Design a protein around this motif. Structure first.
Motif, PDB file in Angstrom:
ATOM      1  N   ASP A   1       0.866  -1.166   0.000  1.00 50.32           N
ATOM      2  CA  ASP A   1       0.000   0.000   0.000  1.00 50.32           C
ATOM      3  C   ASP A   1       0.910   1.226   0.000  1.00 50.32           C
ATOM      4  N   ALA A   2       0.507   2.269  -0.681  1.00 47.12           N
ATOM      5  CA  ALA A   2       1.327   3.488  -0.719  1.00 47.12           C
ATOM      6  C   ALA A   2       2.719   3.153  -1.217  1.00 47.12           C
ATOM      7  N   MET A   3       3.767   3.540  -0.499  1.00 48.22           N
ATOM      8  CA  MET A   3       5.100   3.227  -0.955  1.00 48.22           C
ATOM      9  C   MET A   3       5.386   1.777  -1.245  1.00 48.22           C
ATOM     10  N   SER A   4       4.787   0.849  -0.505  1.00 50.04           N
ATOM     11  CA  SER A   4       5.118  -0.565  -0.733  1.00 50.04           C
ATOM     12  C   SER A   4       4.225  -1.177  -1.794  1.00 50.04           C
ATOM     13  N   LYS A   5       3.349  -0.392  -2.433  1.00 48.13           N
ATOM     14  CA  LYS A   5       2.468  -1.034  -3.434  1.00 48.13           C
ATOM     15  C   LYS A   5       3.302  -1.552  -4.623  1.00 48.13           C
ATOM     16  N   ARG A   6       3.048  -2.810  -4.939  1.00 46.10           N
ATOM     17  CA  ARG A   6       3.724  -3.316  -6.116  1.00 46.10           C
ATOM     18  C   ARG A   6       3.093  -4.621  -6.498  1.00 46.10           C
ATOM     19  N   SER A   7       3.314  -5.035  -7.741  1.00 41.64           N
ATOM     20  CA  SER A   7       2.893  -6.321  -8.199  1.00 41.64           C
ATOM     21  C   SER A   7       3.991  -7.320  -7.856  1.00 41.64           C
ATOM     22  N   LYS A   8       3.614  -8.495  -7.425  1.00 42.07           N
ATOM     23  CA  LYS A   8       4.527  -9.593  -7.243  1.00 42.07           C
ATOM     24  C   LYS A   8       3.985 -10.769  -8.005  1.00 42.07           C
ATOM     25  N   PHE A   9       4.838 -11.530  -8.638  1.00 43.66           N
ATOM     26  CA  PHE A   9       4.426 -12.645  -9.479  1.00 43.66           C
ATOM     27  C   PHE A   9       4.849 -13.947  -8.799  1.00 43.66           C
ATOM     28  N   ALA A  10       3.960 -14.924  -8.851  1.00 41.13           N
ATOM     29  CA  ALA A  10       4.220 -16.239  -8.312  1.00 41.13           C
ATOM     30  C   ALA A  10       4.106 -17.296  -9.404  1.00 41.13           C
TER      31      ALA A  10
ATOM     32  N   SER B   1       0.096 -29.213  -2.817  1.00 35.55           N
ATOM     33  CA  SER B   1      -0.887 -30.305  -2.955  1.00 35.55           C
ATOM     34  C   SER B   1      -2.065 -30.189  -1.995  1.00 35.55           C
ATOM     35  N   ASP B   2      -2.027 -29.231  -1.082  1.00 41.54           N
ATOM     36  CA  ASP B   2      -3.064 -28.984  -0.120  1.00 41.54           C
ATOM     37  C   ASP B   2      -3.811 -27.740  -0.625  1.00 41.54           C
ATOM     38  N   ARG B   3      -5.052 -27.880  -1.017  1.00 38.37           N
ATOM     39  CA  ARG B   3      -5.873 -26.786  -1.458  1.00 38.37           C
ATOM     40  C   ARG B   3      -5.904 -25.545  -0.579  1.00 38.37           C
ATOM     41  N   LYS B   4      -5.758 -25.708   0.744  1.00 38.19           N
ATOM     42  CA  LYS B   4      -5.779 -24.581   1.684  1.00 38.19           C
ATOM     43  C   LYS B   4      -4.640 -23.602   1.340  1.00 38.19           C
ATOM     44  N   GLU B   5      -3.517 -24.081   0.822  1.00 41.61           N
ATOM     45  CA  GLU B   5      -2.379 -23.231   0.525  1.00 41.61           C
ATOM     46  C   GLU B   5      -2.528 -22.511  -0.799  1.00 41.61           C
ATOM     47  N   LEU B   6      -3.599 -22.762  -1.550  1.00 38.65           N
ATOM     48  CA  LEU B   6      -3.874 -21.981  -2.729  1.00 38.65           C
ATOM     49  C   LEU B   6      -4.578 -20.683  -2.391  1.00 38.65           C
ATOM     50  N   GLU B   7      -5.103 -20.522  -1.209  1.00 39.02           N
ATOM     51  CA  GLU B   7      -5.835 -19.281  -0.926  1.00 39.02           C
ATOM     52  C   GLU B   7      -4.957 -18.068  -1.073  1.00 39.02           C
ATOM     53  N   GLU B   8      -5.540 -17.016  -1.623  1.00 49.42           N
ATOM     54  CA  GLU B   8      -4.799 -15.797  -1.896  1.00 49.42           C
ATOM     55  C   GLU B   8      -4.092 -15.297  -0.641  1.00 49.42           C
ATOM     56  N   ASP B   9      -4.829 -15.339   0.486  1.00 54.06           N
ATOM     57  CA  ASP B   9      -4.276 -14.765   1.729  1.00 54.06           C
ATOM     58  C   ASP B   9      -3.018 -15.532   2.131  1.00 54.06           C
ATOM     59  N   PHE B  10      -3.005 -16.873   1.888  1.00 54.84           N
ATOM     60  CA  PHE B  10      -1.811 -17.659   2.224  1.00 54.84           C
ATOM     61  C   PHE B  10      -0.650 -17.283   1.322  1.00 54.84           C
ATOM     62  N   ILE B  11      -0.897 -17.322   0.009  1.00 55.58           N
ATOM     63  CA  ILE B  11       0.161 -16.999  -0.930  1.00 55.58           C
ATOM     64  C   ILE B  11       0.710 -15.596  -0.636  1.00 55.58           C
ATOM     65  N   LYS B  12      -0.184 -14.657  -0.391  1.00 56.58           N
ATOM     66  CA  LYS B  12       0.301 -13.308  -0.123  1.00 56.58           C
ATOM     67  C   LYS B  12       1.086 -13.218   1.176  1.00 56.58           C
ATOM     68  N   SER B  13       0.695 -13.930   2.233  1.00 56.13           N
ATOM     69  CA  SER B  13       1.505 -13.896   3.461  1.00 56.13           C
ATOM     70  C   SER B  13       2.873 -14.513   3.220  1.00 56.13           C
ATOM     71  N   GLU B  14       2.978 -15.513   2.356  1.00 51.87           N
ATOM     72  CA  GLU B  14       4.270 -16.121   2.040  1.00 51.87           C
ATOM     73  C   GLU B  14       5.140 -15.194   1.231  1.00 51.87           C
ATOM     74  N   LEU B  15       4.493 -14.423   0.332  1.00 47.06           N
ATOM     75  CA  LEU B  15       5.246 -13.450  -0.441  1.00 47.06           C
ATOM     76  C   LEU B  15       5.772 -12.366   0.498  1.00 47.06           C
ATOM     77  N   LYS B  16       5.030 -11.963   1.507  1.00 46.57           N
ATOM     78  CA  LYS B  16       5.486 -10.869   2.404  1.00 46.57           C
ATOM     79  C   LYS B  16       6.621 -11.332   3.294  1.00 46.57           C
ATOM     80  N   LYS B  17       6.553 -12.553   3.786  1.00 46.68           N
ATOM     81  CA  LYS B  17       7.540 -13.124   4.683  1.00 46.68           C
ATOM     82  C   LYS B  17       8.861 -13.170   3.914  1.00 46.68           C
ATOM     83  N   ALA B  18       8.649 -13.476   2.647  1.00 44.69           N
ATOM     84  CA  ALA B  18       9.679 -13.763   1.670  1.00 44.69           C
ATOM     85  C   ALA B  18      10.367 -12.494   1.153  1.00 44.69           C
TER      86      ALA B  18
END
Length: 131
Positions: free
Chosen positions: A67-76, A114-131
């Motif tokens: 958001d604001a300064m940190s807004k950016r697209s990230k690709f997975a 292989s676990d459908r729960k890890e496809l959720e946007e919120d999960f992928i996005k938290s992994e991108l932020k940690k990352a």
């Protein structure tokens, strides 16, 4: 003997890399021994729906982060391998994502899921932020 249709897969990759295209995900699937583009979407929930327990696919996804300064697209890059896929085919898919990355060269993070729960946007996005 896995092959890839580089021209067709490049078009799908390039489509998602275009910030203006309105297409935020593409899949790649096996047509026999060649990896080809599958589906396209503008809505992330429609990506999740492609990932059944019976299929294997690769996906390239644009996420909007920050958001604001940190807004950016990230690709997975996501390699989805449903739990019903055999061990032999699971290993071949994970080897073959090297070939997929001859096209899908640039990404923030790649995933093997292989676990459908890890496809959720919120999960992928938290992994991108940690990352």
């Amino acid at each position: 003997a896995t092959k890839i249709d580089k021209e067709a897969c490049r078009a799908a990759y390039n489509l998602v890399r275009d910030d203006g295209s309105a297409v935020i995900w593409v899949t790649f699937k096996y047509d026999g021994s060649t990896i080809v583009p599958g589906e396209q979407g503008a809505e992330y929930q429609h990506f999740i729906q492609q990932c059944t327990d019976d299929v294997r696919l690769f996906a390239f996804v644009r996420f909007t982060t920050g958001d604001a300064m940190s807004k950016r697209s990230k690709f997975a890059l996501i390699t989805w391998i449903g739990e019903n896929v055999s061990g032999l085919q699971r290993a071949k898919t994970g080897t073959d994502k090297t070939l997929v990355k001859e096209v899908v060269q640039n990404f923030a993070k790649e995933f093997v899921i292989s676990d459908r729960k890890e496809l959720e946007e919120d999960f992928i996005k938290s992994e991108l932020k940690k990352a």
